[PDB]
């Protein structure tokens, strides 16, 4: 139904998902001058050493790398979070051009892509229960800028050929998500939502200050994916990002000064 085209894109979402005009919708523009440094913010704790990746799949909206979340294998704690959040999957949002693609923007600046590492609050039992809670999810957002190649991203890039169309999946085990993290863990944080329908306002967003760089050819591979299924007219998977939403009654806190 929904998509990123002119006829079923972001501007149409509200008709099927009224929460699209809610009070804590994402993404937002991060105005660095009005973001408030919070000294009571703890450092993030990212434990991805036991992460067990399983599959990669093109879901017609993006490609996602899924992880085994049956136990506390790869978890996020600390920062503005209270509780353990399990890594379930990560995906990207990218543009048709290098100057667009990220969902969040910094001082109106757009990056070439944006990585979202999706985690759910374990106190809720399963992902489905987590999406019914205001503190159910924690998404780690990482900006991608074009520059030198990111070694840890190449494994992902090499498998894109086998999942070109919607519904295709491939085994993708033993992938280490630690190779996708910047050197610094400083971040901005604010309460928001999922950026694609159902747009549930259950997310504590943690956006890293430091972006990772990827080569021109790495992000180029992203753009060769298809939104369509095999046998259907080809539509390149590009610009699968949602425009910034009004911040409203929310303040962005920074873990750094």
Respond yes or no: is residue 119 known to be catalytic: no
Contact assessment for residue 246 and residue 68, using Cβ atoms and an 8 Å cutoff: no
Q: Which residues bind ligand AL5 (CB under 6 A)?
A: 89, 116, 118, 128, 131, 139, 194-196, 198, 200
Is the Cβ of residue 9 or residue 198 nearer to ligand AL5 in the bound state? 198
Smallest distance, Å, CB 105 to Hg ion?
Answer: 24
Contact assessment for residue 122 and residue 83, using Cβ atoms and an 8 Å cutoff: yes
Among 74, 202, 212, 238, binds Hg ion (CB under 5 A): 202
State yes or no: 91 annotated in a binding site: yes
- 1, 61, 104, 119: the active-site residue: 61
Q: Hey, is 245 helix, strand or coil? A: coil
Examine residue 130 and tell whether it contacts Hg ion (CB under 5 A).
Answer: no
Can you name the residues that pair with 145 across neighbouring β-strands? 213
Q: Which does 128 bind (CB under 5 to 8 A by kind): ligand AL5, Zn ion, Hg ion, none?
A: ligand AL5
Is the Cβ of residue 19 or residue 131 nearer to ligand AL5 in the bound state? 131
Q: Which residues neighbour 222 within 8 Å (Cβ) at sequence distance 6 or greater?
A: 92, 94, 113, 157, 160, 237, 238
Angle subtended at Cα 167 by Cα 195 and Cα 155, rounded to the nearest 5 degrees: 80
How far is it, in rounded angstroms, from Cα 11 to Cα 4? 9
- Note the residues at the interface with Hg ion (CB under 5 A): 200, 202
């Amino acid at each position: 139904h929904w998509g990123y085209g002119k006829h079923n894109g972001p501007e149409h979402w509200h008709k099927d998902f009224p929460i699209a005009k809610g009070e804590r919708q994402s993404p937002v523009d991060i105005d660095t001058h009005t973001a408030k440094y919070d000294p009571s913010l703890k450092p993030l704790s990212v434990s991805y050493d036991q992460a067990t990746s399983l599959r990669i799949l093109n879901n017609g909206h993006a490609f996602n790398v899924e992880f085994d979340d049956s136990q506390d294998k790869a978890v996020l704690k600390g920062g503005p979070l209270d509780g353990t959040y399990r890594l379930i999957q990560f995906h990207f949002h990218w543009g048709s051009l290098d100057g667009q693609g990220s969902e969040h923007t910094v001082d109106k600046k757009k990056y070439a892509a944006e990585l979202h590492l999706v985690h759910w609050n374990t106190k809720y039992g399963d992902f489905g229960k987590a999406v019914q809670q205001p503190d159910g999810l924690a998404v780690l957002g990482i900006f991608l800028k074009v520059g030198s190649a990111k070694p840890g991203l190449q494994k992902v890039v090499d498998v894109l050929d086998s999942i070109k169309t919607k519904g295709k999946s491939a085994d993708f085990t033993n992938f280490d998500p630690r190779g996708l993290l910047p050197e610094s863990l400083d971040y901005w944080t604010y309460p928001g939502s999922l950026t694609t329908p159902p747009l549930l306002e259950c997310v504590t967003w943690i956006v890293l200050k430091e972006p990772i760089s990827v080569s021109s050819e790495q992000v180029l591979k992203f753009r060769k994916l298809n939104f369509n299924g095999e046998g259907e007219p080809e539509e390149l998977m590009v610009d699968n990002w949602r425009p910034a939403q009004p911040l409203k009654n929310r303040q962005i806190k920074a873990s750094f000064k």
